[PDB]
Each structure stands twice: as C-alpha cells, then as structure tokens.
Amino acid sequence: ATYLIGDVHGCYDELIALLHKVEFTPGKDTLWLTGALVARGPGSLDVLRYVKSLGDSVRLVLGNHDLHLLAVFAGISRNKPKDRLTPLLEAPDADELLNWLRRQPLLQIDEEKKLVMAHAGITPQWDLQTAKECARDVEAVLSSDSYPFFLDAMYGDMPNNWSPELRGLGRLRFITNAFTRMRFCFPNGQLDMYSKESPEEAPAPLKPWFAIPGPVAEEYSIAFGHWASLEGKGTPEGIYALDTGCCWGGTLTCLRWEDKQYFVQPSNR
C-alpha cells in the first residue's frame, strides 16, 4: 500500500500511532512525507531518526522548517526557542542526521500513479519539465559541500514571478520559495509571500495556487503540506492538502492512495 502523511513537526508519538493504525509495514508499503519533519513539536530528534531509518520505504520532500533547521545547524540563522530544536542539534548523531536530511529531494514524482509531491505545491507558472530542473538545481546545492552559502542565499521574498531568464541568486530564491513557502497567487501566477490565512478570509485578488490552471496539475494529482490554515479542505479534484496542523493541536492526516482512504490521529497536545 501507499501512504501519504502531512506535516509532522516533531510529533513523533502521533506519527507512530497513525502508522500503527494503518499497520504500516516497510517492504510491503511506502510512506510519502510532505516535509517539515521537525520543529514546534516535542520529538524532532526521534522523528528524524525514524524517518531516516526507513531507507527506501519513505519518499520525502524538504520543507521550510527543514531548511531552517539546516540553517541554524550551519550557524547561518539563529535558534528560535519556539522551534524546540535543541535536543536534535545537541544529539551525538546530529551530523549523520542533518547530512542525510540535506541530501533529500524537493520534489517526488510517481509516473504510474500520476502523482506529484512537494512541500508547498507546484506554481501554476511551472510545467513538469521546469519543476524537475529547478528541483535538481537546488538539491545539487543543498547536497554540496558549500550548502551554507546556498542556505544563506535562500532567504528573500523576491523575485516572485518566474521566468526562464532568471539567473543566480534570484533564480535560487524563487525556486526555494515556490517549493517550500508558496500559498496564494496573483492572477498572473506571481507568488504572494505575505498572506498566510485561509482562502475564504484572504484579500482579493489573491487566489490559492491550486485555484489557477497550471500544466502540472492538469496531468497529475498533487499532494502537499505546509499550509495549515487550509485545514485540508476546499481543494479541487486531484489536489490533496494533507497538513491538518498536528503540532498546533489539530490532527495528523494520512491518505492511503490505492482507495483514497483517510486515517486521522488526534493531536496529543
């Protein structure tokens, strides 16, 4: 079977309970994770240890809080007490864990299921070929020995309109924002990096990135996390918003792909 779970945010207990709910068996089943494995929740260390131990039985994409952890670790950015990342940063095996984490993809594609995964989704301004190229570039930087220079370069809210002519730092910033931070779009598909509310309560003319016809979403189903205020509701057919806000007191949501069956684990705090 194939299982997809949204943003875990250090919620190790809920993750293990939900996987036992569905009898997840490595070797016979596959797990897809929308990223943001760490922060806010109490068990970032345990979550990373376990996901890493799964080996090929998991398909992960990195989110913004994974990148932020990578940036704190490399001394690029400062530790926020609210993240609760200190046990993980101080662990004896922290090197193994984060060096593994930075090698993971931004994008997962399964051709047989016609299924795509990224932390925040796929901008309507990208076709599949372009999304693949951009994922490759950023993953190459992230897995290189010079990853802290990229992590430092990544912070930024511009440019927010994709063009194949973007070069250098602008191109990297836009890729990273599209994959890990995107929420609302302007009618031309340009990213808005400020609105974080639900679609009903957003200002005009902002529209959810998935409310805009794009080449990828016309041929593929898209699963994603990141946008908790969405609450997993109100998406069009073929769009799966799996982030139900576990670390915030919501739920951890798991979707079994074969029959599209949902399983939900209540938040412990």
CB of 184 to Mn ion, least distance (A): 15
Task: Please report where in the chains the tokens 């400062």 appear, as a residue.
Answer: 78
CB of 243 to Mn ion, least distance (A): 6
CB of 247 to Mn ion, least distance (A): 8
- How far is 60 from 102, CA to CA, in rounded Å? 11
Residue 4 or 36 with smaller CB distance to Mn ion: 36
Residue 11 or 171 with smaller CB distance to Mn ion: 11
Residue 10 or 189 with smaller CB distance to Mn ion: 10
- How far is 114 from 137, CA to CA, in rounded Å? 23
| 251-256/221-224 β-pairing | unpaired
Residues that bind Mn ion (CB under 5 A): 7, 36, 226
Residue 59 or 226 with smaller CB distance to Mn ion: 226
3-state secondary structure of 262: strand
CB of 65 to Mn ion, least distance (A): 7
Residue 1 or 155 with smaller CB distance to Mn ion: 155
Please, which residues bridge with residue 265 across strands? 252
- How far is 149 from 144, CA to CA, in rounded Å? 10
CA distances from 78 to 48, 86, 180, 265 (A): 20, 12, 19, 32
Q: Which residue is nearest to Mn ion (CB)?
A: 7
Phi-psi map region of 84: left, alpha, beta (phi>0 left; psi -120 to 50 alpha): left
Residue 171 or 226 with smaller CB distance to Mn ion: 226
CB of 152 to Mn ion, least distance (A): 22
Per the CB < 8 A criterion, the answer to whether 12 and 39 are in contact is: no
CA atoms within 13 A on the CB side of 179: 33
CB of 226 to Mn ion, least distance (A): 5
